[PDB]
Amino acid sequence: MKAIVVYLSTSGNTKAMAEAIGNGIESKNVDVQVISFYDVKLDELKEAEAIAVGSSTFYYKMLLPMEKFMDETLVASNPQGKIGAAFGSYGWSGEAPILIAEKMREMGMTVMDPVLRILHKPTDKDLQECKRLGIDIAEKVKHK
Ligand SMILES: Cc1cc2nc3c(=O)[nH]c(=O)nc-3n(C[C@H](O)[C@H](O)[C@H](O)COP(=O)(O)O)c2cc1C
């Protein structure tokens, strides 16, 4: 089975989170690809049993390219009933991962806890939190 970790990142912080989530999924022998939203194909979303989506927060929102990706591409992938996860890096208000999770639920996805947001640059211990989210995603995939 297969998971995909899709992200938007402006300075690398959400990207670092995404790669650590993927490392956690790999560690449980679930296939995974960690990929920027710009490069992901519709078929790759359709193929996946679990889709984790991450964005940083700019002016209290996920950035517009990610909002479009979610409203157009993710909806078109027919994700009803799939495992979802939401994450991102932020500086003080941190709305984007909350908004991502809400969008996923509206789409019919079952969003795992925790929705994971991390201030500024992830420390090593922060990246262990990310790895744990990936382990949890893999275990959820294998349980289904
Ligand atoms: C122009 C700009 C606007 C930002 N606005 C917010 C904001 O409204 N709320 C917040 O929590 N962080 C805000 N941030 C902080 C970023 O979310 C934070 O630096 C984050 O670590 C960037 O992660 P990334 O490298 O994955 O893009 C802003 C940063 C910039 C540069």
Which tokens hold the place of 7?
């992200």
Please name the residues in contact with 102: beta carbons below 8 A apart, sequence gap of 6 or more: none
By most ligand atoms within 8 Å of CB, the mutation choice from 7, 58, 118 for ligand 1 is 58
Rounded alpha-carbon distances, angstroms, from residue 78 to 34, 71, 112, 123, 137 = 20, 12, 18, 35, 19
Query: Can you give the resolution of this entry in Å?
Result: 1.7
Nearest of 63, 31, 17, 38 to residue 138 by alpha carbon: 31
Nearest of 120, 40, 52, 58 to residue 87 by alpha carbon: 52
Ligand 1 center to 88 CA (angstroms):
10
Which tokens hold the place of 127?
């990246």
Q: Is the dihedral of CA 90, 118, 36, 43 positive or negative?
A: negative
Nearest atom of ligand 1 to the alpha carbon of 121: 21
How many CB atoms neighbour CB 36 within 10 A? 14
Ligand 1 center to 34 CA (angstroms):
21
Verify cis geometry, omega within 30 degrees of 0, for the bond prior to 114.
Answer: yes
